[PDB]
């Protein structure tokens, strides 16, 4: 079968469980579309009721920040009449406003401005859908694909810069406050049976060191790359290339969402992470199989300095095998970050700068996660991961 008709292998990760992930492979010829702009894309997807098997080919670059006549939309097109960044900055300055959540005129105007952008950039993908990039240059710029449905395949697309024009100031986030934005490249919100393969994720032509700092904190226009929340389950992410971005992948959005326990069954394999700061992934609750991935970065980078790879969150059950990390000077314990409620991690074959390490033992965690992965393809030796991943991961390697 061709790229549009290929399905997830019967043993290829948690996405292969139960009914498996076949996307729109059973589509008739009338439900095979070739799209090259936002209008064609939204028309082919249809609404939530469009559950008929469908195959969508993305040809060329699709900019999501455009109006219905395909005219590019910027800051001034989305801005609410009352919103003014200079007035926003003056109103919520920590020295005069304090550490309380922004409220009043400028925050209400900013929120309305954000909703104007949300309407163009966020699109929902209906059940039984395959979205694949045509050739080696298929790109989605500015969009946020949201998957709340079952049985979806997304492959061979470069997703760039899911950019929020109106970041919100949150003085209570962390120790010194932080600027927060709303859009990811892909948001899995309760979606099941999903395969994300051979895609590339980056911040395009607007990386984070092109943003100024306000209140001593970077004015952050980005959020996640591939995030999963609210009971998302049975997902395989393979051969993806994540690079030049801060917060990559958050699986499980909150410590109080106890209904995520038993869900968030995700398999990550053969992915490349280059110049990724943190959360790759950060996990709460889920049984996540992480194998044959390659992480490379530098703690002294001037754009995206490495902080940590795996985030061991509340009740997480990460099972990691033969992963390779190349970050000069990093100690074994600092490859991961442990959060309250995180007490277990299984890791075998971890290579840090050419030497075998045990991340779990270095952090005093238990190795008993209560499960062993049953669905997986062949496992590469740690010695061959770097070459395999650099040569095969990312969009444009297939077509
Ligand atoms: Ca997110």
Swiss-Prot record:
Pathway: Glycan metabolism; pectin degradation; 2-dehydro-3-deoxy-D-gluconate from pectin: step 2/5
Cofactor, free-text remark: Binds 1 Ca(2+) ion per subunit.
Positions with a binding annotation for Ca(2+): 184, 223, 227
MF annotations from Gene Ontology: metal ion binding; pectate lyase activity
Active site, per annotation: 279
Keyword vocabulary terms for this entry: Calcium, Lyase, Metal-binding, Secreted, Signal
Annotated GO CC locations: extracellular region
Cofactors required: Ca(2+)
EC primary class: lyase
Keyword Secreted: yes
UniProt cross-references to Gene3D superfamilies, sorted A to Z: Single-stranded right-handed beta-helix, Pectin lyase-like (2.160.20.10)
GO biological process, alphabetically ordered: pectin catabolic process
Bias (Basic and acidic residues): 98-111
Temperature dependence as stated in the record: Optimum temperature is 42 degrees Celsius.
Induction text: Negatively regulated by TnrA under nitrogen-limited conditions.
Superkingdom of origin: Bacteria
Reaction catalyzed: Eliminative cleavage of (1->4)-alpha-D-galacturonan to give oligosaccharides with 4-deoxy-alpha-D-galact-4-enuronosyl groups at their non-reducing ends
Subcellular location: Secreted
Pfam families: Pectate_lyase_4
Sequence segments annotated as region (Disordered): 96-118
pH dependence: Optimum pH is 8.4.
Assembly: Monomer.
Family label: Belongs to the polysaccharide lyase 1 family.
Protein function: Produces unsaturated products from polygalacturonate.
Protein name: Pectate lyase
Protein's organism: Bacillus subtilis (strain 168)
